[PDB]
Amino acid sequence: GKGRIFQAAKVYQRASEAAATNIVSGLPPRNPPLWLKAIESIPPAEINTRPYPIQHSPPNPRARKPRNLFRPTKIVYPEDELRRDFYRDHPWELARPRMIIELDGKDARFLDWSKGLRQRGIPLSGESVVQRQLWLMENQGMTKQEAYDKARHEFYKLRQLEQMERRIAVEEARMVGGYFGKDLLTVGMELENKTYESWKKWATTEIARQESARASMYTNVVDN
Amino acid sequence: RYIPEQYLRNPPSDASLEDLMAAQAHMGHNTSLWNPANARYIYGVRQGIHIISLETTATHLRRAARVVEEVAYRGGLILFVGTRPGQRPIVVRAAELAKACHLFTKWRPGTITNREQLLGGVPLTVVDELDRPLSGFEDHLHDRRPLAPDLVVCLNPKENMTLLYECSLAKIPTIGIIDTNTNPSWVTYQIPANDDSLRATALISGVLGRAGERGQKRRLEAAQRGVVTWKTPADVQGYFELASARAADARRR
Amino acid sequence: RLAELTPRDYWTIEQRLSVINDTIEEFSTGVPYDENIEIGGKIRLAIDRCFKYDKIDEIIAALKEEAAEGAKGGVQSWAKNTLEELTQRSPTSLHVTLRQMRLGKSWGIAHTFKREHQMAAKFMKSHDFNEGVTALLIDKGANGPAKWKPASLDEIPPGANISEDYFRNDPEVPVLELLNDRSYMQYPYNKFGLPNDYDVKEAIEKGNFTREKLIDHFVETRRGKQGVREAVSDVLDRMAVRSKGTEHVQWKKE
Amino acid sequence: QHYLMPLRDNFEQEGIRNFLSPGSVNMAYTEYQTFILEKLNALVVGTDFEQKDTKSIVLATARDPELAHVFNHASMAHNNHFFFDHLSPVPVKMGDKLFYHINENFGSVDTLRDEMIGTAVSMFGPGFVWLVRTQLPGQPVALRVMATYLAGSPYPGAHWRRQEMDAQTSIGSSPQGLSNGQRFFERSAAGFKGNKLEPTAPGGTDLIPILCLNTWEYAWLREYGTGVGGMGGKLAYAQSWWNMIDWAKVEEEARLETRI
Amino acid sequence: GVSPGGALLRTSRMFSLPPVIPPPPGNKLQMISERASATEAYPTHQVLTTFESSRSRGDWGLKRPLPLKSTTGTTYPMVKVKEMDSLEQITDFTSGTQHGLTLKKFQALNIPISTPSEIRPVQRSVFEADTDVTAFSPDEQIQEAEKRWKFSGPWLAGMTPGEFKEYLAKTVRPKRAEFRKFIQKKIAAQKTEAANRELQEKPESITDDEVTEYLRRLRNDNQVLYDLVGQFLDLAPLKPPSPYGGRGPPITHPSAGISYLRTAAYLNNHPIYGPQKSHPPVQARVLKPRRGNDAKIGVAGFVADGPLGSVMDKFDPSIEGGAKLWVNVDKATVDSTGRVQLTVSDAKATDVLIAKELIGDAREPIFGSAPK
Amino acid sequence: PNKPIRLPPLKQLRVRQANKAEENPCIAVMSSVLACWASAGYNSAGCATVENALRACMDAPKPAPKPNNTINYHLSRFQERLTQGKSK
RNA sequence: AACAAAAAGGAUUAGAUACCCCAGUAGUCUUUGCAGACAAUUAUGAAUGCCAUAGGUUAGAUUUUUAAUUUAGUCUAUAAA
RNA sequence: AAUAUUUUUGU
Ligand SMILES: [K+]
Ligand SMILES: [K+]
Ligand SMILES: [K+]
Ligand SMILES: [Mg+2]
Ligand SMILES: [Mg+2]
Ligand SMILES: [Mg+2]
Ligand SMILES: [Mg+2]
Ligand SMILES: [Mg+2]
Ligand SMILES: [Mg+2]
Ligand SMILES: [Mg+2]
Ligand SMILES: [Mg+2]
C-alpha cells in the first residue's frame, strides 16, 4: 500500500465536529475557522465512481459477455473518413502550414457552407473541401464521389489563382522599380553549401583515418 | 480577438465553453497514462489522448469560484500555489486581485504541520474589519504561532502532493486542477482540466482571482456599513480573555 | 448535484432556495448568441399600448391602428398576425379571460382556485367548450373549424356583459376545499429569474446609477447570470429616458 | 478579420461638397476598400498577419518576394485611407509655421502646388504623390516630393517597394537611360545581397509622409470623367484637391522643430 | 442530439487534424534502415504554425507548450507532431521545414504537372473535366475508363504473390453470386437492342441457362471477358487492347496537391530586356557523379536525373560547396508510387547571365557595358 | 524480431563508466618495440626508429582530462517516464 | 564409441577417504518385467462466480488488413484491496 | 575475456 489516506473531502465534517465543543469542559467553544461558514453550503462532488461512459459508436450487439464497460470510447465523426481520402489524394497539402491554435473558440459561428469554399475566419485547406463535401452530400443528396468532385474542383480554381498572384505580383513590382530580397531557392542552396563543406571535412578526416588502419594491419616495425 | 497576455491584463469573470476549448483545457494525457478513478470527467478518446468534458470543466470551475469568493468574503487567507517553469506570473497576478499569498517554488515539506519552525521569524500583523492595522498586539505577535492558509488553490496537484496532504491532515480545504492522470481524491474541489497547458492555467487562475476580488469587495463594502462578516479567530480570542484577566488586577490593585 | 446537497434542519427556506439557485446556475452553458428577445422593444411596447383597456372592443380597435400602414409603432406585421388569431377564438372566452386578468391582480393564491372552480364549473355547461373541444381534439379539425355560439365579437353588442355570470359561484357546486389554509397575495419566492421592470425600477428609485453603470449593478448582484445584460438593457430601452444625460437615468412615465 | 472603418467627417454619407460627390466617395472608399479588405482577409486568413495592422503588414511583407501580392492590398488599403483622412470638409488656412517652412524648401506655395499636380499627370499611371519630411541625423528638417506607383510605400522600412521610376520608359541607351539602368541594377544587387545603399536612422524616422494624393483611376474616373478637351479629367481632379487639404493636420503630422 | 460541449469539439481546430497517411510506398521485398530514417518522398504529418507572439511562449495549440530552444530563432516556424502525448508525457514533435519549404521551392519554379508521356511533346494539364474525375456510373464503358485516375481495385501486376492470393480469396471469390447478377443486367440489355431496333423500322433476364451459356461463348475470346470482369471490380486496365498503365495508376491525385497550375504557356516579361524566350534557370546540385550509370542532381529539394549530355564526369573535392550547375526544369510529373519526377533539361548561356544581372553575380553586365 | 522491452523499475538508471577510459598511448609504442626485439633482435639496428619513438612518448606530457559526461543526469530525469518507475 | 559410482594409482596437504589428475567396472542406450520413493515445486490441490489499469509476448479471428478491436494463454509493473 | 596452489582452530 504505497498510497496515503487522503481525507480532503471531509475537512468540513472533521472541522465541524472539532469546533462543536471545547476541549476544556465547562467553557463555550471558541470561534471556528473563517472558512467553516464559507463552504457551509457548498459540499464536494462525488469522486471515484465509475459510470457508464458516453457511447460514441453503437456497441457490439452480438457480444454476450462484453468487457470494458467503463472505458471511454473513441470519438469518430463522418468527416474523419473524408479527411483521410482527401489528404491521401493530396499528400503535399499537408506541407501547407495550418494553425490549430484557436483564438476565441467562436470560429464555427460564421461558417455557412452553402456559400462556397471560402469562409470567414478559417483558411482554404483540405478541411473546407471536407466541410463543403459533407454539406452537398447531405443537403443536396449527392453521393460521396459526386460531392467530392464538385468540392474538389472549386478548390483547384482557388489555389491556381494563388500561385499566379505570386508570379505576377513580383513581375509587376519590378516594372516600376521594385526589388526584393533573397528568394527561398537561393537561401536553400546557400545552406547546403555550409553543410556540404562540413561533410567534406568529415570525409577527408575519416578517409585518412582508414589509411592508418590499412597500414597498421601489416607489421613493418623492423624497418628492413 | 486573442492576445497571449490577455488572461493577466484583464482576466474574465467567468469562463465559457469557447474560452476553455480555445485554451486547450480539454487535452488530457495519453490513454495509456490515465487514472480510471477520474473517468467521470472524460468525454471520449481522440488523437490518442482523453478528452475532458467541456461542460464538466465549466461546472467545476464555477463552483470553485464560488468557494474562493465566500472564503474571501469571510476574511479567509487564500494561497495560490503553482510551481512550474512559467506559472509564476499567473499565480502572482491572481494573488494581487484576491489579496492572497502566492507560491511559485517547491513547497518546503512541513510548512503547515511544522509551521512553528519553518515560519518562525516571518512577521505578521493584526488588522481590523477594514484591513487597517491595529496597535496594541505587540505581545501577541511574539507568542502567536504562524498562520495557515484557509484555502489552497493548486494549479498542478500532480506535482506537489506533500502540500495537499498537509492540508487534508490539517483540515484545510483545497482546489486543484485534476488532469486525466491525477488522483482526484487529493483535493476537496476538483477542476477537471489540462494542467500541462500554460494557457488553460492562466484562464482558471484569472477566474478564481476575480472571484476573490469580487469577494473582498463585498466584505470591505459591508464593513463601511458596520457589518462585519467574520468574528475574531480562536487564537486572538484567547488573548483577549487573558488581557481582561491581567487588566482586572490593575483595577483591584 | 441536488441530491448531494444536505441542508441543516435549522436553515430557513430562504437559505435552502439560495443554495439551490446557485447550484442551477453552475450548469448554465449560456443563452444563444444570435437569438434576440422576441417580446422586446417594439413588440413589447405595442403589447402595453393595446392590452391596457378593459374591453376587447378597444383592444382590437387599438391593434387595428398598429396594423394600419404608416403607424409609428413598427409592429404592422405583428399586429396583423395578432388580429388573425383573435378573430379565430371563442368571443365568450376572450371576454371572460380579460375579465379575470383585471380581477386576478387582487385575488389570493387560494381564493383563485376557489373562484376558478366555480368559474370552470359553468364552462362545462357552456356551448363553446363542448363544441371547440369536440371540433379540434375529438374530430381533429374535421367538419371545418369550430362554430361558437356567438359568431364573432361584433355580434356581442357594447352593452352586453356576458363576462358576469361566470363570476357568480352557485350553491349547487360546493366550494373547493383545499388541502391547507396557506395563502399569499404575492409570490413569496419568485425573484430567481431575470430582472423585470419591477426590479430595475426599485434600483433606479433607490440609487443614482447611469445608463451603463446600472446594467453592471445587476451583473454583480446576480453573480453574472446569463442574459442579465440583455434583459436589463431592454428594460432601459423602453422605460428609461436620458433626461440629465449620462449623469443619471430616469423613467419615461414620470 | 480586417474590417472597414468610417471616414473622417462623414464623407461616406455626404462626401466633400466641391471635391467628390457622395456617390463617388461611395465607390472610392466604401466599395473599393471593402473589396481590398475582402481580398486581404483571404490572404492573411490563417497567417500571422491575421491580427496585424496594415502598416505592420506593409513593412513585414515589403521585401519578401513570395508575399508581394499581400503587400499590394496592405499598402493600397493604407495609402487609400491615408489620402481621404487628410481631406478637410472645408478649406483650411495654411499655418504660419508650415507656410514659412514650405517656402524654404520649394520657394513658394505655388511652386509646390504645380510640382505635385504636375508630377501626377506626368506619371501617366496609378499611384500616390507624397509630401515627405526628410530629416537626417544632423541635417535640418527638409521636405520633398515623392511619387509612388500602383502600390508603393514611402516609408524607409519599405524601401523595397518604393516604385518611384518606371523601368519601361526610364532605362534605355541614352545617357540618362544608362544612369537610371545602373541604379536599377545597383539596388537589386545590393538589396539581394543585403547591403544597404543609403544609411537610415533606426525606427524609420528619416521619412515621415505628411500629405498624400491618390491618382488612381477609380478615384476620379467617375467625378471628373476622362477629361477630353481639358474639361475636368485627372488635371482638374488634382487642382480641386488642392482646395481641401487639411493644412492644420498636415502641419501637426509634420512636427516641425521650433525654428522661429 | 450532441451536447453543446461535444459540438464545439467537432468544429475545433485540433479535431481537424488529418490522420497520419501511410508513408510513400516502397519495395516490399527489400532492405531498409531502422535506427535511422531520412526525409520521406511526400509529407505524412500536418505542418503547424503559430503567431510570433505565441511562439515566444511555446504555445502551438497542443497539449503542452513546446520548448523554446529548438522552436525559436528560425524564420519559418514549422513543426510536426507525431504524438500529442507519448508514454513519456511529452509532445513528440520535430521540425517540419523539411517538407514545408520544399513545397515553397517547387511552387517557386512556376511549373504545372502534366500526365506522363510515352517516348512530339504534348503537355496536357492534370485538372480537367475529362480526365480529373472520380465519380462514375455503370453506363460508362471501357472507352471512358482510360480517363479515370482513382480506381477501387488494385493493380494486379504490382501486387505481390501473397497480396494477390489474399485478393483472390477474400475479395474476388465471395463475389460470384453478385457477378452473375451483373451479367443478367447486361443480357437484359442485349435482348432490348433487337426489340428496340425492330420497333423503329426489357426482359427480366433471370435465367441461369443464359448466364451460364453466355460465359461459354466468351471462352474463345478471353479479351472481351477481361473488360467485363474489370468493370465489376474496377481494375486498372493493363493490356493496351492504354491509359499509361504500364507502371500502374497513381496511388494519389496525379498532382499530389503540390502545384495547382494547369499550363506553362506564358512568357515572363523582363523589365528591361522584355519578354524572354524560356523560363529563368535554377541552380542545381551535383550528386552521385557518373563515375552508377547515371548522375543525380538536386533541383529545389528534389532528386532527378541529369540532362542528356566536367562536373558530371568525376568528383572534385577542391570545388568548395560542391559542383553546382544552372539548369532549366522542362517537365514535372508524379509517378505511380507518388514521387515527383522532374525532366531537368540543360539551360542556355544567355539565360543564366541574365538571371544573375538581378543578383550581382554576372562578371560583365549585359546592360550598358556590353558592346556586342 | 521483437522490440526493446520496457525496463523494470530500477533504483537508478545510470551507466557505470560515463566518460570513456583513456588508454595510455605509450603502452602501444612499447608493444611495437617488443615486437622488433622478438623478430629483428635486441642489439640490432631495425629497432632504432622504434626505440626512439618510445623515448619521445614518455618524454611528452600526458593530455588533460576531458570534461565529464552528463549522461547520468539526463537518465535520471526520464527514468520514471522511460522505465516502469523507481524502486527503493 | 563416449561418459562414469565402484575398485585402483599419481599429486595436493599437518593428515586427504576428498576437491585436481592418469586410467577405469557396473551403469547410462535397446527389448521384457519388477520397483513406486523425489525441492515429483508455482515450497501455492482441483474447480466455479466475481474486482480497476498499463507495458510486452504466444496461436488465431475481424476490419477503413496502414493500424486498431477481440477470444484463449503466458510474463512483468501497479490501483482498490 | 573462460582465468583458478594451500590457508584449520578460539573455555
Ligand atoms: K575418463
Ligand atoms: K508398475
Ligand atoms: K496480456
Ligand atoms: Mg498533466
Ligand atoms: Mg587417492
Ligand atoms: Mg530410458
Ligand atoms: Mg522431477
Ligand atoms: Mg486432487
Ligand atoms: Mg510460456
Ligand atoms: Mg506481478
Ligand atoms: Mg566458539
Curated annotation (Swiss-Prot), chain A:
Compartment annotation: Mitochondrion
Top-rank lineage group of the source organism: Eukaryota
Gene Ontology CC annotation, any one: mitochondrial small ribosomal subunit
GO MF term (any one): structural constituent of ribosome
Record's keyword terms, sorted: Mitochondrion, Ribonucleoprotein, Ribosomal protein
UniProt xrefs under InterPro entries: Ribosomal_mS23_fun
Pfam families per UniProt: MRP-S25
Main function: Component of the mitochondrial ribosome (mitoribosome), a dedicated translation machinery responsible for the synthesis of mitochondrial genome-encoded proteins, including at least some of the essential transmembrane subunits of the mitochondrial respiratory chain. The mitoribosomes are attached to the mitochondrial inner membrane and translation products are cotranslationally integrated into the membrane.
PANTHER family given in the database record: 37S RIBOSOMAL PROTEIN S25, MITOCHONDRIAL (PTHR37799), SMALL RIBOSOMAL SUBUNIT PROTEIN MS23 (PTHR37799:SF1)
Subunit structure: Component of the mitochondrial small ribosomal subunit (mt-SSU). Mature N.crassa 74S mitochondrial ribosomes consist of a small (37S) and a large (54S) subunit. The 37S small subunit contains a 16S ribosomal RNA (16S mt-rRNA) and 32 different proteins. The 54S large subunit contains a 23S rRNA (23S mt-rRNA) and 42 different proteins.
Family as reported in the entry's similarity comment: Belongs to the mitochondrion-specific ribosomal protein mS23 family.
The protein, known as: Small ribosomal subunit protein mS23
Organism per entry: Neurospora crassa (strain ATCC 24698 / 74-OR23-1A / CBS 708.71 / DSM 1257 / FGSC 987)
Curated annotation (Swiss-Prot), chain B:
GO molecular function: structural constituent of ribosome
This protein's record includes keyword Mitochondrion: yes
Keyword Iron-sulfur: no
Domain of life: Eukaryota
Keywords: Mitochondrion, Ribonucleoprotein, Ribosomal protein
Gene Ontology process terms (BP): translation
Compartments, as annotated in UniProt: Mitochondrion
Gene Ontology cellular-component annotations: mitochondrial small ribosomal subunit
Family assignment from sequence similarity: Belongs to the universal ribosomal protein uS2 family.
The protein's assembly and partners: Component of the mitochondrial small ribosomal subunit (mt-SSU). Mature N.crassa 74S mitochondrial ribosomes consist of a small (37S) and a large (54S) subunit. The 37S small subunit contains a 16S ribosomal RNA (16S mt-rRNA) and 32 different proteins. The 54S large subunit contains a 23S rRNA (23S mt-rRNA) and 42 different proteins.
UniProt function note: Component of the mitochondrial ribosome (mitoribosome), a dedicated translation machinery responsible for the synthesis of mitochondrial genome-encoded proteins, including at least some of the essential transmembrane subunits of the mitochondrial respiratory chain. The mitoribosomes are attached to the mitochondrial inner membrane and translation products are cotranslationally integrated into the membrane.
Protein name per UniProt: Small ribosomal subunit protein uS2m
